[PDB]
Design a binder for this molecule. Structure first.
Ligand SMILES: CC[C@H](C)CN(C[C@@H](O)[C@H](Cc1cc(F)cc(F)c1)NC(=O)O[C@H]1CO[C@H]2OCC[C@H]21)S(=O)(=O)c1ccc([C@H](C)O)cc1
Lengths: 99, 99
């Protein structure tokens, strides 16, 4: 699907058997999700954005179905105000910017 | 132009007679630029991100030439780590996400 940007590009994702809505973010290099419970072992990490830095838990090789498109990659879980789909997963489902 | 997301979607912008590089950010509702001077009267505002919040100066009806595509809209200037082109200006240049 082609997505115009007159509204926030929110899509429905399926991660760990849970349904959530996430923001297709071309300005994000990696995926960051709000607090949730994810299987497996994680490693602590600190990511930076506007306003400073937050502590997140890095989960590797996590499957996500983004708007019916499957992808596996690293997912960061932490106090993000909004669920974000970063470029690490956008490239797997073949997303492009066109103008 | 079609832009893949394997690298940061950076574009050359022309704003206030100055040349800068900015990130086409679909995850940003507003355009946020590092410190500079623009015309007209401004009003203070505070915007939030992953790490918290930063104080910005809201400038309205500001012209920006993004990769040769002109657009006028609100531009926020403040201590952002990276120049961000938000959806307020992406819609003006006809930007879409495609997968
Ligand atoms: C350094 C370049 C960018 C600042 C990186 N960011 C992506 C941006 O798209 C971000 C998305 C966003 C949307 C949102 F609603 C809440 C929120 F907290 C974050 N936009 C943003 O801050 O927008 C501002 C301005 O407009 C306003 O509207 C919405 C909020 C305000 S990031 O999220 O910091 C980030 C993500 C992933 C990684 C991985 C580890 O690589 C690192 C860093």
């Amino acid at each position: 699907p082609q997505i115009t940007l007159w509204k926030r590009p929110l899509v429905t994702i399926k991660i760990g058997g849970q349904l959530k809505e996430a923001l297709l973010d071309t300005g994000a290099d990696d995926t960051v999700l709000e607090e949730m419970n994810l299987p497996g072992r994680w490693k602590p990490k600190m990511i930076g954005g506007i306003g400073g830095f937050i502590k997140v838990r890095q989960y590797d090789q996590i499957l996500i179905e983004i708007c019916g498109h499957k992808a596996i990659g690293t997912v960061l879980v932490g106090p993000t105000p909004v669920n974000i789909i970063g470029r690490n997963l956008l490239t797997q489902i073949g997303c492009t910017l066109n103008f």
